[PDB]
């Protein structure tokens, strides 16, 4: 009784754990009460208990520092025993750990321990290990003497002492600066996938030992460099306790034939001797490149040696093999045969939210000025991966360091803690570093959840509903679809006049679902056609599956038909190399993949009709030009983020701009904005957009869709219904 | 549950709360007729959205005569006005408020009908001082329904070191098959939750299930002398009632002190925030410390602060076991 | 049964890999007895522009390999080749010569009794109310193909699902669902195309 399963915490603070409120109510303890946690090897830790809205009833959420003090790991169980008898401390003696205090000197109490404990009233027990961050260093301390025993609450009147040599770390304790799960920012879905596939066979092998089904044997991670492929594998090994054996291409390929295979198989033998263990092979494409590209003895023999070593995993119990490559098709396909590397995970490129979290991880030890805005940085760093954000934080720190160290002039082996304590990194130092940094993943397609929501689309209320029903009804009422033998549609084609929201509709449904949006534009379809590289379509569909839940949006389906003449035409017809691959892959998509395929075109009369055959883009939605009330909604949405004067009559403008699409009403809004900007600048050499600027803007904008085009679009819609 | 009527000090049960407060508000007219009518408007009427609309419309009538006291057309509020009839006349206590702040209820000939109509006409006594209605308007606008005070049932406890002395069997750390099945299923479900395509409405149906558990809170205060002080509050009670609660228990109710929240965040007595807004609901432990103005004299004199609470409460200390 | 679809014929043509035709026929030889079905024989002709396209003839790299393999295949292997096209006017006439697909069968739109049979067969997967008059519907859907009768069945089913879901915010497909479907379903072959198909069949006598 009173025992909970140890899980991850959200609050990084080292003196608190979080329980689900019903367990605090059964234990009759209040938020903020001090409790003891009973761990392994007759150890205990003292902490404050709070609660949150994410902890399960049977779980206790604690960070890495608390788990290390209890010598427990994620998945273990501890007992909770409230200790209201804890008294206030009179004198506490704290000394640093030598492993983290090297190269730094000065008064550690004034910089670290004092602000850490001051007015914090943290519970302290003799032998506790805790981390204090600051001055671009992470320093941990051990408590060696407490006047009250064995635990107390620190108070502003408690005497804090610190004299003596730094303490040498015990060999059974891991450093708090090691890689763990809290060092991974984005790609939480991929990390969860690894947890399921890896923790089970390493922690509970009995589920496979007594039965004829084998565990997963190998996981192939792929994506651009600097995305966390080695970070995830290392974090998992450290958190679970499995021995991490690091292998990489160059280390093996630099060796001579015979030696290279000996080193490879030796690592596998050591993994068993020290099992549980994870064998991680980085740059797998260097170990096992495509055979037709090489004839060397090392490149060919190392593949045969790796293939048989992977098969040996049947006997190498508690050992799993992971590898990293750039793309799933950059390695010898033999490694992906039954068994061996049976699972794969696409790490991808962190999105704006993930990039912010990555920056927050790197700045853990950094003192930031009040002007620093890491969210603004994360939004600007498009195309960057974690390796680039790590360099960004380092460069910003180095700029701040140079500015102050030129005045500090500390010439010695160690640096004072005080001078580091006052060193802050400003927004100008991040902006400077941003101008010097260069993204390593700018060429690859970036896929993320779009920010376009339903409030950004004027009109089309019936279309908004249909897109929501196509996701809610097939999953809430599967019995009714089966009852009548109907298969839910897995795609829709949008057609009609341009500038009415075709793209926004596909993004808005992805936004509300928190699904990834993959945007394929005309130039991309044309690049594959022109370069005779239509095989790349298979990669697009494969990315959509890995990105699930996602919306796979194929825009400008007529881009190739128009490139071939559109209204005139070259020596071909409606079908081409690229659409043929799309048609072939489309037939392989299932409603269970959580991928919704959306197409769009402004000329549906010139696209391969095969795409509309049953089983593909079965839904057909016509997007007409907006009516009067929709045009007003469009104007209001376009001006949602701008100051607008009260004299601006948006209904009056909408009444006149009868032929204007949403794209054309935006031009009017942006023209009025630009006019207001000129007025403000010239006045300095007014703070809101006045009617005069909208009235002039309307004199320059024109309708993009003519009356002839409206009839063409309506006739097509009526033809298909 | 026991409650105290804040207007009389009477001891009430949960069912007697409205009956006694309503009567106490009607009695309060002998001390402050305006304050009694203000309490009557918010307390007797259960529909608080209609109470606010009636109060805003009354505030407008008072501003009209306040801004233009020289024009007699703003001295009379017509009880048959299409706005008055829906917003003000539908509430109990609004008629008494007009009389309390210097209006007389009279029947005046209509501008186009033989039948006299009902008006509240401001008298010369209050019209001569427009600042009187301005203050009465502010008193009504800042008002809220009167609720019986929850009996705090203050208790003092002494933690017993014996509660922390317990040895576990070694097998208590061996994860069971039932715990393993749930952990393995949760690993698969967590990946399925992130992998599945779902709209925000389908997500809300499950997420919203955790939002409605509590309406009361229990607070404990850790005193520097090792004693624990406990009492009960509304989930929406103000921080000032916790400071008053502690002041009542202290041997010296005037002696300045500070309270800290469950995370160490200092709470100031002058910050009139609700306990559910302070993060002290459904339960929390607060830390007690004497103000620096008090600690400086105790330390400078070499005194031992060996007494915090009244002897009348300390004689009733229970052990925590 | 070996099924070759348009996308495979187009892949071989576009990628200049018509040699793969030999592997297709080799499968038929090893799979015998078998039926070797080449669907969408006009898939390449349409990919070449169909009615306009280039200035050349109907011959192409893939059909040439297919015709060669056909001539080299004996009836002693118990392999029978079937072709299908919805645009016979744009396929290589060589495939119709003696020794190839010299037997021609015209498949018109289903007649009155056949359309009823199609509706009944397509509805075997769903509950249908006793008030549904499938013969009346078939009489109206005079210009509908079997695929278009499926669209009606699917629309009536989806309409039954829509109403059933709404009732919880029905147990079977009612006449109203089929009559409503009749207002959304359309024939895929226009009256001009129906006459073209009949006139082509008449031209071949
Ligand atoms: N997803 C991520 N989350 C957090 N940090 C990341 C992530 N991806 C990369 N990094 C950071 O970038 C660097 C990656 O370098 P390295 O350790 O060689 O890993 P890899 O090259 O496999 O990505 C590390 O400093 C790591 O902390
Ligand atoms: N229905 C609409 N509501 C609001 N804005 C619209 C709408 N349709 C078009 N716009 C405006 O037109 C711009 C382009 O829209 P987009 O969806 O990219 O057009 P398309 O899909 O035809 O390329 C958007 O920035 C948006 O401001």
Domain ranges of chain A: 1-86, 87-169, 178-349, 350-444, 445-626, 627-705
Report the alpha-carbon distance of residue B68 to residue B140 in Å, rounded. 21
Q: How many C-beta atoms lie closer than 10 Å to residue A87's C-beta? A: 14
Q: Which of B194, B199, B185 is nearest to A191 (CA)?
A: B194
Q: Are A577 and A528 in contact (CB under 8 A)?
A: yes
Report the alpha-carbon distance of residue A619 to residue A132 in Å, rounded. 58
Contact A571 C126 (CB under 8 A): no
Q: Which of A668, A703, A311 is nearest to A497 (CA)?
A: A703
Three-state SS annotation for A409-474: CCCCCCEEHHHHHCCCECHHHHHHHHHHCCCCCCCCCCCECCCCCHHHCCCCHHHHHHHHHHHHHH
Tokens 């160690």 belong to A414
Number of helices (H) and strands (E) in chain B: give both, helices first: 12, 13
Report the alpha-carbon distance of residue A323 to residue A233 in Å, rounded. 9
Q: Do the domains A178-349 and A445-626 sit in the same CATH topology, yes or no?
A: yes
Q: How many C-beta atoms lie closer than 10 Å to residue B263's C-beta? A: 17
Q: Are A56 and A91 in contact (CB under 8 A)?
A: no
Q: Are B262 and B279 in contact (CB under 8 A)?
A: yes
CATH class of C111-189: mainly alpha
* Cα–ligand 1 centroid distance for B195 (angstroms): 24
Dihedral-angle region of residue B73 (phi above 0 means left; psi in -120 to 50 means alpha; beta otherwise): alpha
Report the alpha-carbon distance of residue A367 to residue A424 in Å, rounded. 5
- Strand A104-105 and strand A415-416: the pairing is parallel
Radius of gyration from C-alpha coordinates of chain C: 21
Structure tokens at A15: 């003196």
List CB contacts of B232: < 8 A, sequence separation 6 or more. Answer: B150, B151, B152, B153, B216, B217, B218, B219
Report the alpha-carbon distance of residue A545 to residue A113 in Å, rounded. 50
On the question of a cis peptide bond just before residue B77, with omega within 30 degrees of 0, the verdict is no
- The enclosing H or E element of C151 equals helix C146-166
Q: At what angle do helices A522-530 and A577-586 cross, to 10 degrees?
A: 110
Q: What technique solved it?
A: cryo-EM
| Chain B contact for A75 (CB, 8 A cutoff) | yes
Burial-class residue A448 by CB neighbours within 10 Å (0-12, 13-18, 19+): buried
Burial-class residue B300 by CB neighbours within 10 Å (0-12, 13-18, 19+): exposed
> Is A445-626 assigned to CATH 3.40.50.300?
yes
- Strand (E) positions, A226-382? 243-248, 277-282, 319-325, 343-346
Burial-class residue C26 by CB neighbours within 10 Å (0-12, 13-18, 19+): exposed
Q: Residue C173 phi/psi, 5° resolution?
A: -85, 115
Q: Are C86 and C39 in contact (CB under 8 A)?
A: no
> Looking at ligand 1, which atom is closest to the CA of residue A186?
1
List CB contacts of B113: < 8 A, sequence separation 6 or more. Answer: none
Nearest-CA residue for atom 20 of ligand 1: A226
Report the alpha-carbon distance of residue A83 to residue A61 in Å, rounded. 19
List CB contacts of A702: < 8 A, sequence separation 6 or more. Answer: A664
Q: What is the least distance, in Å, from the CA of C76 to any CA of chain A? A: 35
DSSP characters for B44-67? H-S-HHHHHHHHHHHHHHHHHHHH
Comparing CB atoms, the residue among A480, A486, A575 nearest residue C47 is A575
Q: Which of A427, A441, A218, A203 is nearest to A313 (CA)?
A: A218
Three-state SS annotation for A493-524: EEECCCCCCHHHHHHHHHHHHCCEEEEECHHH
Contact A85 B164 (CB under 8 A): yes
CATH architecture group of domain A627-705: Orthogonal Bundle (1.10)
Report the alpha-carbon distance of residue A128 to residue A45 in Å, rounded. 7
Structure tokens at A523: 């130039």
Structure tokens at A328: 């799933």
Resolution of this deposited model, Å:
3.9
Structure tokens at A86: 């804890």
Q: Are B51 and B42 in contact (CB under 8 A)?
A: yes
Three-state SS annotation for chain B: CEEECCCCCCEEECCCHHHHHHHHHHHHHHCCHHHHHHHHHHHHCCCHHHHHHHHHHHHHHHHHHHHCCCCHHHCEEECCCHHHHHHCCCCCCHHHHHHHCCEEEEEECCCCCCCCEEEEEECHHHHCCCHHHHHHHHHHHCCCCCCCEECCCCEEEEECHHHHCCCCCHHHHCCCHHHHHHHHHHHHHHHHHHHCCCCHHHHHHHHHHHCCCCCEEEEEEECCCCCEEEEEEECCCEHHHHHHHHHHHECCCCCCEEEECCCCCEECCCCCCECCCCCCCCEEEEEEEECHHHHHHHHHCCCCCCCCECHHHHCCCEEEC
- Strand (E) positions, B123-192? 149-150, 155-159
Contact A119 B180 (CB under 8 A): no
Running DSSP on this structure, what letter comes out for residue A112?
I
Tokens 């009527």 belong to B5
On the question of a cis peptide bond just before residue A420, with omega within 30 degrees of 0, the verdict is no
Q: Which residues pair with C79 in a beta bridge?
A: C34
Q: Residue C52 phi/psi, 5° resolution?
A: -115, -80
Q: Which of A467, A522, A521, A460 is nearest to A491 (CA)?
A: A467
* Cα–ligand 2 centroid distance for B143 (angstroms): 49
What CATH code would you report for A87-169? 3.10.330.10
- Which residues of C fall within a CB distance of 8 Å from A572? 47-49, 53-54
What ligand has the least distance to the C-alpha of A392?
1
Structure tokens at A293: 């590209």
Three-state SS annotation for A559-606: HHHHHCCCCCCCCCCCCCHHHHHHHHHHCCCCHHHCEEEEEEECCHHH
Q: Are A548 and A593 in contact (CB under 8 A)?
A: yes
Q: At what angle do helices C146-166 and A461-476 cross, to 10 degrees?
A: 90
Q: Are A148 and A155 in contact (CB under 8 A)?
A: no
What ligand has the least distance to the C-alpha of A522?
2
Report the alpha-carbon distance of residue B58 to residue B91 in Å, rounded. 12
In the sheet that holds B318-320, the strands lie side by side as: B266-267, B257-260, B283-290, B216-222, B228-234, B155-159, B318-320
* Cα–ligand 1 centroid distance for A366 (angstroms): 18
Report the alpha-carbon distance of residue C15 to residue A58 in Å, rounded. 60
What does chain C come to in residues?
A: 205
Q: At what angle do helices A536-546 and A577-586 cross, to 10 degrees?
A: 30
Report the alpha-carbon distance of residue A253 to residue A250 in Å, rounded. 5
Structure tokens at A352: 């704006």
The gap from C-alpha A478 to its chain's centroid, in whole angstroms, comes to 31
* Cα–ligand 1 centroid distance for A552 (angstroms): 28
On the question of a cis peptide bond just before residue A150, with omega within 30 degrees of 0, the verdict is yes
CATH architecture group of domain A178-349: 3-Layer(aba) Sandwich (3.40)
Half-sphere exposure of A124 (CA within 13 A, CB side): 30
- Which residues of C fall within a CB distance of 8 Å from A537? none
List CB contacts of C1: < 8 A, sequence separation 6 or more. Answer: C34, C35, C37
Report the alpha-carbon distance of residue B5 to residue B21 in Å, rounded. 6
DSSP characters for C65-133? HHHHHHHT--GGG-EEEEE--S-GGGS-GGGGSTTSS----------HHHHHHHHHHHGGGS-B-TT--
End-to-end CA distance of chain A: 65
Q: Are B258 and B289 in contact (CB under 8 A)?
A: yes
- The enclosing H or E element of B98 equals helix B94-100
Structure tokens at B180: 């393993």
Structure tokens at B60: 């407008």
> Is A350-444 assigned to CATH 1.10.8.60?
yes
B partners (3+ CB pairs within 8 A) are A
Q: Which residues pair with B118 in a beta bridge?
A: B107
On the question of a cis peptide bond just before residue A276, with omega within 30 degrees of 0, the verdict is yes
Q: Are A709 and A664 in contact (CB under 8 A)?
A: no
Tokens 């393999």 belong to C69
Q: How many C-beta atoms lie closer than 10 Å to residue A339's C-beta? A: 15
Determine if ligand 1 sits within 6 Å of the CB of residue A503: no
Structure tokens at B71: 């024009």
Contact B198 A513 (CB under 8 A): yes
CATH class of C1-110: alpha beta
Contact A548 B188 (CB under 8 A): no
Q: Are A582 and A612 in contact (CB under 8 A)?
A: no
Q: Are A48 and A42 in contact (CB under 8 A)?
A: no
Our answer on whether C and A touch (3+ beta-carbon pairs < 8 Å) is yes
CATH class of A1-86: mainly beta
For the CA atoms of C87, C88, C94, C98, what is the dihedral angle to 10 degrees? 150
Q: Residue A157, SS3?
A: coil
Q: How many C-beta atoms lie closer than 10 Å to residue A341's C-beta? A: 23
What does chain B come to in residues?
A: 321
Report the alpha-carbon distance of residue C133 to residue C120 in Å, rounded. 11
Q: Ligand 2: which residues within 6 Å by Cβ?
A: A 457-460, 498-504, 634, 637-638, 662-663, 666
């Amino acid at each position: 009784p009173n025992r909970l399963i140890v899980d991850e915490a959200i609050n990084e603070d080292n003196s608190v754990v979080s329980l689900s409120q019903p367990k605090m109510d059964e234990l009759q303890l209040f938020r903020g009460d001090t409790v003891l946690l009973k761990g392994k090897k007759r150890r205990e830790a003292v902490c404050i208990v709070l609660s949150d809205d994410t902890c399960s009833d049977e779980k206790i959420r604690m960070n890495r520092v608390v788990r290390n003090n209890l010598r427990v790991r994620l998945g273990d169980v501890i007992s909770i025993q409230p200790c209201p008898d804890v008294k206030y401390g009179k004198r506490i003696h704290v000394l640093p750990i030598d492993d983290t205090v090297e190269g730094i000197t000065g008064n550690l109490f004034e910089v670290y321990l004092k602000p850490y404990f001051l007015e914090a009233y943290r519970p302290i027990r003799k032998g506790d290990i805790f981390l204090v961050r600051g001055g671009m260093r992470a320093v941990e301390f051990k408590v060696v003497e407490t006047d009250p025993s064995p635990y107390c609450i620190v108070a502003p009147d408690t005497v804090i002492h610190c004299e003596g040599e730094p303490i040498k770390r015990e060999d059974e304790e891991e450093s708090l600066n090691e890689v763990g799960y809290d060092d991974i920012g984005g790609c939480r879905k991929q990390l969860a996938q690894i947890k399921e596939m890896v923790e089970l066979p390493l922690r509970h092998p009995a589920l496979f030992k007594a039965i004829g089904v084998k565990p997963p044997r190998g996981i192939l991670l792929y994506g651009p460099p600097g995305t966390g492929k080695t970070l995830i594998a290392r974090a998992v090994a450290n958190e679970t306790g499995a021995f991490f054996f690091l292998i990489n291409g160059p280390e093996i390929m630099s060796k001579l034939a015979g030696e290279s295979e000996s080193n490879l198989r030796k690592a596998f033998e050591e993994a068993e001797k020290n099992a549980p263990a994870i064998i991680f092979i980085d740059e797998l494409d260097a170990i096992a490149p495509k055979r037709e590209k090489t004839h060397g003895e090392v490149e060919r023999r190392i593949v045969s040696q790796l293939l048989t070593l992977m098969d040996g995993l049947k006997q190498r119990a508690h050992v799993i093999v992971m590898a990293a490559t750039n793309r799933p098709n950059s390695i010898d396909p033999a490694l992906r045969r039954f068994g061996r590397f049976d699972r794969e995970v696409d790490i991808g490129i962190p999105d704006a939210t993930g990039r912010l979290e990555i920056l927050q991880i790197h700045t853990k030890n950094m003192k930031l000025a009040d002007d620093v805005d890491l969210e603004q940085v994360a939004n600007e760093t498009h195309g960057h991966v974690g390796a680039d954000l790590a360099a960004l934080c380092s460069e910003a720190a180095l700029q701040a360091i140079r500015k102050k160290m030129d005045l500090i002039d500390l010439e010695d082996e160690t640096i004072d803690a005080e001078v580091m304590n006052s060193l802050a990194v400003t927004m100008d130092d991040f902006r400077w570093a941003l101008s010097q940094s260069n993204p390593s993943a700018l060429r690859e397609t970036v896929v993320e959840v779009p920010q376009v929501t339903w409030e950004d689309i004027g009109g089309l209320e019936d279309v908004k509903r249909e897109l929501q029903e196509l996701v809610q009804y097939p999953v809430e009422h599967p019995d009714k679809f089966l009852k009548f033998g109907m298969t839910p549609s897995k795609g829709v084609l949008f057609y009609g006049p341009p500038g009415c929201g075709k793209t926004l509709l596909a993004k808005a449904i992805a936004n509300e679902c928190q699904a990834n949006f993959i945007s394929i534009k005309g130039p991309e379809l044309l690049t594959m056609w022109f370069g005779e590289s239509e095989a790349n379509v298979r990669e697009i569909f494969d990315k959509a599956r890995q990105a699930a839940p996602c919306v796979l949006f194929f825009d400008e389906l007529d881009s190739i038909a128009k490139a071939r003449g559109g209204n005139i035409g070259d020596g071909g017809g409606a079908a081409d190399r690229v659409i043929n691959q799309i048609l072939t892959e489309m037939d392989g998509m299932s409603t269970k993949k959580n991928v919704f395929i959306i197409g769009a075109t402004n000329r549906p009369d010139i696209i391969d009709p095969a795409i509309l055959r049953p089983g593909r883009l079965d839904q057909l939605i016509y997007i007409p030009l907006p009516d009067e009330k929709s045009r007003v909604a469009i104007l209001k949405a376009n001006l949602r983020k701008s100051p607008v004067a009260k004299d601006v009559d948006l209904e009056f403008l909408a009444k006149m701009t009868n032929g204007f699409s949403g794209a054309d009403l935006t031009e009017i809004c942006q023209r009025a904005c630009k006019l207001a900007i000129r007025e403000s600048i010239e006045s300095e050499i007014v703070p809101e957009i006045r009617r005069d600027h909208f009235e002039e803007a309307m004199r320059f904008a024109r309708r993009s869709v003519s009356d002839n085009d409206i009839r063409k679009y309506e006739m097509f819609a009526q033809t298909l219904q | 549950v026991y409650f105290t009527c804040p207007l009389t000090g009477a001891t009430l049960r949960k069912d007697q709360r409205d009956a006694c407060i309503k009567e106490a508000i009607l009695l309060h007219f002998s001390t402050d007729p305006v304050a009694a009518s203000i309490m009557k408007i918010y307390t007797f009427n259960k529909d608080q959205d209609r109470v606010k609309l009636g109060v805003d419309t009354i505030a407008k009538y008072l501003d009209n005569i306040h801004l233009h006291p020289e024009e007699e057309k703003y001295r009379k509020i017509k009880l048959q006005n299409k706005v008055f009839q829906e917003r003000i006349n539908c509430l109990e206590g609004t008629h008494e408020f007009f009389e309390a702040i210097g209006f007389q209820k009279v029947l005046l000939p209509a501008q186009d009908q033989e039948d006299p109509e009902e008006f509240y006409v401001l008298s010369e006594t209050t019209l001569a001082q427009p600042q009187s209605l301005e203050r009465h308007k502010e008193q009504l606008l800042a008002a809220e329904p009167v609720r019986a005070k929850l009996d705090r049932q203050r208790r003092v406890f002494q933690p017993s070191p014996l509660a922390s002395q317990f040895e576990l069997p070694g097998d208590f750390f061996n994860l069971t098959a039932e715990e393993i099945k749930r952990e393995q299923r949760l690993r698969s479900e967590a990946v399925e939750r992130l992998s599945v395509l779902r709209t925000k409405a389908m997500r809300e149906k499950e997420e919203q299930r955790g939002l409605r558990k509590y309406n009361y809170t229990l607070l404990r205060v850790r005193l520097p002398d090792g004693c624990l002080l406990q009492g009960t509050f509304y989930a929406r009670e103000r921080l000032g009632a916790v400071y008053g609660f502690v002041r009542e228990a202290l041997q010296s109710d005037w002696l300045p002190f500070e309270l800290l929240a469950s995370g160490g965040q200092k709470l100031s007595e002058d910050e009139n925030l609700a306990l559910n807004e302070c993060g002290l609901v459904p339960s929390a432990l607060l830390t007690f410390s004497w103000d620096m103005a008090v600690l400086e004299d105790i330390k400078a004199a070499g005194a031992e602060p060996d007494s915090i609470l009244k002897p009348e409460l300390l004689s009733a200390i229970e052990k925590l076991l």
